[PDB]
Scaffold this active site. Structure first.
Site, PDB file in Angstrom:
ATOM      1  N   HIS A  40      -5.700  -1.845  -6.198  1.00 31.51           N
ATOM      2  CA  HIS A  40      -6.222  -0.477  -6.246  1.00 31.51           C
ATOM      3  C   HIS A  40      -5.209   0.537  -6.768  1.00 31.51           C
ATOM      4  O   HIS A  40      -5.558   1.693  -7.011  1.00 31.51           O
ATOM      5  CB  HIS A  40      -6.768  -0.034  -4.874  1.00 31.51           C
ATOM      6  CG  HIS A  40      -5.723   0.274  -3.834  1.00 31.51           C
ATOM      7  ND1 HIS A  40      -5.350  -0.625  -2.864  1.00 31.51           N
ATOM      8  CD2 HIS A  40      -5.027   1.412  -3.575  1.00 31.51           C
ATOM      9  CE1 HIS A  40      -4.452  -0.075  -2.064  1.00 31.51           C
ATOM     10  NE2 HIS A  40      -4.237   1.165  -2.478  1.00 31.51           N
ATOM     11  N   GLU A  71      -7.854  -8.073  -4.031  1.00 28.28           N
ATOM     12  CA  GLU A  71      -7.050  -6.893  -4.138  1.00 28.28           C
ATOM     13  C   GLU A  71      -5.649  -7.180  -4.529  1.00 28.28           C
ATOM     14  O   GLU A  71      -4.757  -6.999  -3.763  1.00 28.28           O
ATOM     15  CB  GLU A  71      -7.124  -6.054  -2.887  1.00 28.28           C
ATOM     16  CG  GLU A  71      -6.207  -4.866  -2.952  1.00 28.28           C
ATOM     17  CD  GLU A  71      -6.896  -3.614  -3.331  1.00 28.28           C
ATOM     18  OE1 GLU A  71      -8.093  -3.569  -3.306  1.00 28.28           O
ATOM     19  OE2 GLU A  71      -6.234  -2.638  -3.632  1.00 28.28           O
ATOM     20  N   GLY A 145       0.812   5.432   1.028  1.00 23.11           N
ATOM     21  CA  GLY A 145       1.983   5.182   0.192  1.00 23.11           C
ATOM     22  C   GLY A 145       2.816   3.940   0.479  1.00 23.11           C
ATOM     23  O   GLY A 145       3.985   3.890   0.111  1.00 23.11           O
ATOM     24  N   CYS A 147       1.150   0.534   0.536  1.00 26.66           N
ATOM     25  CA  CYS A 147       0.420  -0.410  -0.289  1.00 26.66           C
ATOM     26  C   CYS A 147       1.256  -1.026  -1.394  1.00 26.66           C
ATOM     27  O   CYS A 147       1.768  -0.299  -2.230  1.00 26.66           O
ATOM     28  CB  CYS A 147      -0.829   0.303  -0.863  1.00 26.66           C
ATOM     29  SG  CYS A 147      -2.202   0.580   0.339  1.00 26.66           S
TER      30      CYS A 147
HETATM   31  C1  LIG Z   1     -10.099   4.400   7.040  1.00 27.94           C
HETATM   32  C2  LIG Z   1      -9.796   3.669   5.765  1.00 27.94           C
HETATM   33  C3  LIG Z   1      -8.574   3.010   5.425  1.00 27.94           C
HETATM   34  C4  LIG Z   1      -8.826   2.495   4.124  1.00 27.94           C
HETATM   35  C5  LIG Z   1      -7.839   1.720   3.282  1.00 27.94           C
HETATM   36  O1  LIG Z   1      -7.055   0.983   3.833  1.00 27.94           O
HETATM   37  N1  LIG Z   1      -7.847   1.900   1.892  1.00 27.94           N
HETATM   38  C6  LIG Z   1      -6.901   1.226   1.125  1.00 27.94           C
HETATM   39  C7  LIG Z   1      -7.304   1.194  -0.324  1.00 27.94           C
HETATM   40  C8  LIG Z   1      -8.208   0.005  -0.622  1.00 27.94           C
HETATM   41  C9  LIG Z   1      -9.420   0.237  -1.247  1.00 27.94           C
HETATM   42  C10 LIG Z   1     -10.256  -0.811  -1.504  1.00 27.94           C
HETATM   43  C11 LIG Z   1      -9.882  -2.051  -1.163  1.00 27.94           C
HETATM   44  F1  LIG Z   1     -10.704  -3.030  -1.429  1.00 27.94           F
HETATM   45  C12 LIG Z   1      -8.671  -2.295  -0.545  1.00 27.94           C
HETATM   46  C13 LIG Z   1      -7.831  -1.244  -0.271  1.00 27.94           C
HETATM   47  C14 LIG Z   1      -5.670   2.057   1.247  1.00 27.94           C
HETATM   48  O2  LIG Z   1      -5.778   3.229   1.414  1.00 27.94           O
HETATM   49  N2  LIG Z   1      -4.417   1.413   1.166  1.00 27.94           N
HETATM   50  C15 LIG Z   1      -3.152   2.053   1.263  1.00 27.94           C
HETATM   51  C16 LIG Z   1      -2.288   1.741   0.039  1.00 27.94           C
HETATM   52  O3  LIG Z   1      -2.451   2.442  -0.938  1.00 27.94           O
HETATM   53  C17 LIG Z   1      -2.625   1.919   2.686  1.00 27.94           C
HETATM   54  C18 LIG Z   1      -3.455   2.258   3.964  1.00 27.94           C
HETATM   55  C19 LIG Z   1      -4.113   3.583   3.928  1.00 27.94           C
HETATM   56  C20 LIG Z   1      -4.869   3.849   5.156  1.00 27.94           C
HETATM   57  C21 LIG Z   1      -3.952   3.839   6.365  1.00 27.94           C
HETATM   58  N3  LIG Z   1      -3.056   2.686   6.423  1.00 27.94           N
HETATM   59  C22 LIG Z   1      -2.506   2.251   5.141  1.00 27.94           C
HETATM   60  O4  LIG Z   1      -2.003   0.992   5.274  1.00 27.94           O
HETATM   61  N4  LIG Z   1     -10.038   2.844   3.790  1.00 27.94           N
HETATM   62  O5  LIG Z   1     -10.604   3.515   4.764  1.00 27.94           O
END
Ligand SMILES: Cc1cc(C(=O)N[C@@H](Cc2ccc(F)cc2)C(=O)N[C@H](C=O)C[C@@H]2CCCNC2=O)no1
Length: 181
Positions: A40, A71, A145, A147
Protein backbone atom coordinates in the site's frame (compact mmCIF):
# COMPACT_ATOMS: atom_id res chain seq x y z
CA UNK A 1 22.91 -9.89 22.33
CA UNK A 2 22.89 -11.87 19.03
CA UNK A 3 19.25 -11.04 18.34
CA UNK A 4 19.76 -7.28 18.20
CA UNK A 5 23.32 -7.46 16.87
CA UNK A 6 21.74 -9.16 13.85
CA UNK A 7 19.18 -6.32 13.74
CA UNK A 8 21.93 -3.75 13.62
CA UNK A 9 23.55 -5.79 10.83
CA UNK A 10 20.27 -5.56 9.08
CA UNK A 11 19.86 -1.90 9.92
CA UNK A 12 23.10 -0.75 8.40
CA UNK A 13 23.14 -2.95 5.36
CA UNK A 14 19.53 -3.64 4.25
CA UNK A 15 17.06 -1.23 5.78
CA UNK A 16 16.54 2.10 4.02
CA UNK A 17 14.17 5.00 4.55
CA UNK A 18 11.62 5.52 1.76
CA UNK A 19 8.99 8.08 0.81
CA UNK A 20 6.37 7.28 -1.78
CA UNK A 21 3.31 9.42 -2.61
CA UNK A 22 1.59 7.53 0.19
CA UNK A 23 3.97 8.55 2.96
CA UNK A 24 6.91 7.24 4.92
CA UNK A 25 7.86 3.58 4.93
CA UNK A 26 10.74 1.27 5.70
CA UNK A 27 12.27 -0.55 2.81
CA UNK A 28 14.01 -3.86 2.88
CA UNK A 29 16.83 -4.52 0.47
CA UNK A 30 16.79 -8.26 -0.15
CA UNK A 31 19.73 -8.68 -2.58
CA UNK A 32 21.40 -6.93 -5.51
CA UNK A 33 18.78 -4.40 -6.65
CA UNK A 34 15.70 -6.02 -5.23
CA UNK A 35 13.66 -4.60 -2.37
CA UNK A 36 10.28 -5.14 -0.71
CA UNK A 37 7.64 -2.58 0.22
CA UNK A 38 4.22 -3.10 1.78
CA UNK A 39 1.90 -3.12 -1.19
CA UNK A 40 0.00 0.00 0.00
CA UNK A 41 3.01 2.29 -0.09
CA UNK A 42 2.31 2.05 -3.83
CA UNK A 43 5.62 2.92 -5.45
CA UNK A 44 5.26 4.41 -8.90
CA UNK A 45 7.78 4.88 -11.69
CA UNK A 46 10.07 6.48 -9.08
CA UNK A 47 10.61 6.73 -5.31
CA UNK A 48 12.68 8.50 -2.65
CA UNK A 49 15.32 6.50 -0.81
CA UNK A 50 17.09 8.53 1.79
CA UNK A 51 15.84 11.53 -0.11
CA UNK A 52 17.85 10.70 -3.29
CA UNK A 53 15.58 9.97 -6.28
CA UNK A 54 15.77 6.36 -7.32
CA UNK A 55 14.26 4.98 -10.55
CA UNK A 56 11.95 2.01 -10.27
CA UNK A 57 12.39 -0.53 -13.04
CA UNK A 58 10.30 -3.57 -12.07
CA UNK A 59 7.50 -3.84 -9.51
CA UNK A 60 5.38 -6.88 -8.67
CA UNK A 61 2.60 -7.06 -6.08
CA UNK A 62 2.42 -10.50 -4.51
CA UNK A 63 -0.65 -12.78 -4.41
CA UNK A 64 -2.20 -16.02 -3.18
CA UNK A 65 -2.25 -18.94 -5.59
CA UNK A 66 -5.94 -18.10 -5.11
CA UNK A 67 -4.93 -14.59 -6.16
CA UNK A 68 -5.45 -12.75 -2.89
CA UNK A 69 -3.39 -9.78 -1.61
CA UNK A 70 -0.30 -10.46 0.27
CA UNK A 71 0.21 -6.77 0.69
CA UNK A 72 3.76 -6.82 -0.45
CA UNK A 73 5.49 -5.41 -3.45
CA UNK A 74 8.83 -6.46 -4.83
CA UNK A 75 10.69 -3.60 -6.46
CA UNK A 76 13.81 -3.62 -8.60
CA UNK A 77 15.68 -0.38 -7.92
CA UNK A 78 17.96 1.36 -10.42
CA UNK A 79 21.61 1.31 -9.14
CA UNK A 80 25.16 -0.03 -9.33
CA UNK A 81 24.74 -0.43 -5.54
CA UNK A 82 24.17 -4.05 -4.48
CA UNK A 83 22.03 -5.11 -1.57
CA UNK A 84 23.88 -7.62 0.62
CA UNK A 85 21.77 -10.79 0.13
CA UNK A 86 19.88 -11.53 3.36
CA UNK A 87 17.66 -14.17 1.70
CA UNK A 88 19.26 -17.02 3.66
CA UNK A 89 17.73 -15.59 6.76
CA UNK A 90 14.19 -15.60 5.41
CA UNK A 91 12.52 -18.82 6.46
CA UNK A 92 11.51 -21.56 4.06
CA UNK A 93 7.99 -21.18 5.53
CA UNK A 94 6.10 -18.35 7.17
CA UNK A 95 7.09 -19.11 10.80
CA UNK A 96 5.73 -17.64 14.02
CA UNK A 97 8.39 -16.41 16.44
CA UNK A 98 9.42 -16.03 20.02
CA UNK A 99 10.69 -12.68 20.97
CA UNK A 100 10.63 -10.47 17.93
CA UNK A 101 11.90 -6.98 17.61
CA UNK A 102 10.71 -4.67 14.85
CA UNK A 103 13.46 -2.81 12.85
CA UNK A 104 12.04 0.45 11.48
CA UNK A 105 13.93 3.17 9.70
CA UNK A 106 12.06 6.11 8.17
CA UNK A 107 12.95 9.81 8.07
CA UNK A 108 10.99 10.19 11.24
CA UNK A 109 11.77 6.91 12.97
CA UNK A 110 15.47 6.30 12.37
CA UNK A 111 17.24 3.30 13.78
CA UNK A 112 14.17 2.32 15.71
CA UNK A 113 13.82 -1.06 17.43
CA UNK A 114 10.39 -1.89 18.76
CA UNK A 115 9.91 -4.87 20.99
CA UNK A 116 6.64 -6.43 19.85
CA UNK A 117 7.35 -9.61 21.75
CA UNK A 118 5.83 -12.81 20.40
CA UNK A 119 4.64 -12.84 16.79
CA UNK A 120 1.90 -15.42 16.24
CA UNK A 121 0.11 -16.32 13.00
CA UNK A 122 -3.24 -14.90 12.04
CA UNK A 123 -3.72 -15.42 8.27
CA UNK A 124 -6.61 -13.78 6.42
CA UNK A 125 -7.01 -10.19 7.59
CA UNK A 126 -9.42 -7.62 6.25
CA UNK A 127 -7.91 -4.27 7.27
CA UNK A 128 -8.92 -1.45 4.92
CA UNK A 129 -11.56 -3.30 3.06
CA UNK A 130 -8.83 -4.87 0.98
CA UNK A 131 -8.25 -8.29 2.50
CA UNK A 132 -4.83 -9.92 2.87
CA UNK A 133 -3.51 -13.42 3.37
CA UNK A 134 -0.56 -14.96 5.21
CA UNK A 135 -0.39 -12.16 7.81
CA UNK A 136 0.86 -12.61 11.38
CA UNK A 137 0.01 -10.79 14.61
CA UNK A 138 2.07 -9.31 17.42
CA UNK A 139 0.50 -7.87 20.60
CA UNK A 140 1.64 -4.33 20.29
CA UNK A 141 -0.06 -0.91 19.70
CA UNK A 142 1.66 -0.32 16.32
CA UNK A 143 1.19 3.22 14.92
CA UNK A 144 1.22 4.93 11.51
CA UNK A 145 4.41 5.48 9.55
CA UNK A 146 5.81 2.07 10.57
CA UNK A 147 4.47 -0.05 7.72
CA UNK A 148 7.27 -1.88 5.91
CA UNK A 149 9.40 -2.22 9.01
CA UNK A 150 11.23 -5.50 9.37
CA UNK A 151 10.34 -8.28 11.90
CA UNK A 152 13.41 -10.19 13.21
CA UNK A 153 13.66 -12.82 15.91
CA UNK A 154 16.82 -14.87 16.43
CA UNK A 155 18.54 -13.97 13.14
CA UNK A 156 15.52 -14.65 10.97
CA UNK A 157 13.51 -12.34 8.73
CA UNK A 158 9.90 -13.39 9.01
CA UNK A 159 7.84 -10.29 8.38
CA UNK A 160 7.16 -6.89 6.92
CA UNK A 161 4.74 -4.85 9.01
CA UNK A 162 1.42 -3.84 7.43
CA UNK A 163 -1.58 -3.20 9.64
CA UNK A 164 -2.56 -2.44 13.20
CA UNK A 165 -5.57 -1.49 15.18
CA UNK A 166 -4.30 0.39 18.17
CA UNK A 167 -3.54 -2.60 20.41
CA UNK A 168 -2.22 -5.24 18.05
CA UNK A 169 -0.02 -4.92 14.98
CA UNK A 170 0.00 -7.24 11.96
CA UNK A 171 2.82 -8.14 9.63
CA UNK A 172 3.01 -9.58 6.18
CA UNK A 173 4.65 -12.98 6.68
CA UNK A 174 7.62 -13.79 4.45
CA UNK A 175 8.90 -17.04 2.95
CA UNK A 176 12.08 -17.35 0.94
CA UNK A 177 10.40 -18.47 -2.31
CA UNK A 178 9.19 -14.89 -2.77
CA UNK A 179 12.65 -13.65 -3.63
CA UNK A 180 13.44 -16.57 -5.91
CA UNK A 181 13.78 -15.10 -9.44
C1 LIG B 1 -8.53 0.97 11.90
C2 LIG B 1 -7.71 0.61 10.69
C3 LIG B 1 -6.32 0.28 10.67
C4 LIG B 1 -6.06 0.04 9.29
C5 LIG B 1 -4.72 -0.33 8.71
O1 LIG B 1 -3.97 -1.02 9.36
N1 LIG B 1 -4.38 0.15 7.44
C6 LIG B 1 -3.12 -0.15 6.92
C7 LIG B 1 -3.08 0.07 5.44
C8 LIG B 1 -3.54 -1.17 4.68
C9 LIG B 1 -4.55 -1.03 3.74
C10 LIG B 1 -5.00 -2.13 3.06
C11 LIG B 1 -4.44 -3.32 3.31
F1 LIG B 1 -4.89 -4.35 2.64
C12 LIG B 1 -3.43 -3.47 4.24
C13 LIG B 1 -2.99 -2.37 4.93
C14 LIG B 1 -2.22 0.84 7.57
O2 LIG B 1 -2.65 1.91 7.87
N2 LIG B 1 -0.87 0.48 7.80
C15 LIG B 1 0.12 1.30 8.40
C16 LIG B 1 1.34 1.44 7.49
O3 LIG B 1 1.29 2.30 6.63
C17 LIG B 1 0.24 0.95 9.87
C18 LIG B 1 -0.98 0.84 10.85
C19 LIG B 1 -1.90 1.99 10.81
C20 LIG B 1 -3.01 1.83 11.75
C21 LIG B 1 -2.50 1.72 13.18
N3 LIG B 1 -1.40 0.77 13.34
C22 LIG B 1 -0.43 0.74 12.25
O4 LIG B 1 0.31 -0.40 12.35
N4 LIG B 1 -7.18 0.22 8.64
O5 LIG B 1 -8.14 0.54 9.47
Amino acid sequence: GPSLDFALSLLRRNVRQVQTDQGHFTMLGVRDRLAVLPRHSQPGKTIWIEHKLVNVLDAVELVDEQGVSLELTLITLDTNEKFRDITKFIPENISTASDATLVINTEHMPSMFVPVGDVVQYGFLNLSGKPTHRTMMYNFPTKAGQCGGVVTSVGKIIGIHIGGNGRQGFCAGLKRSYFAS
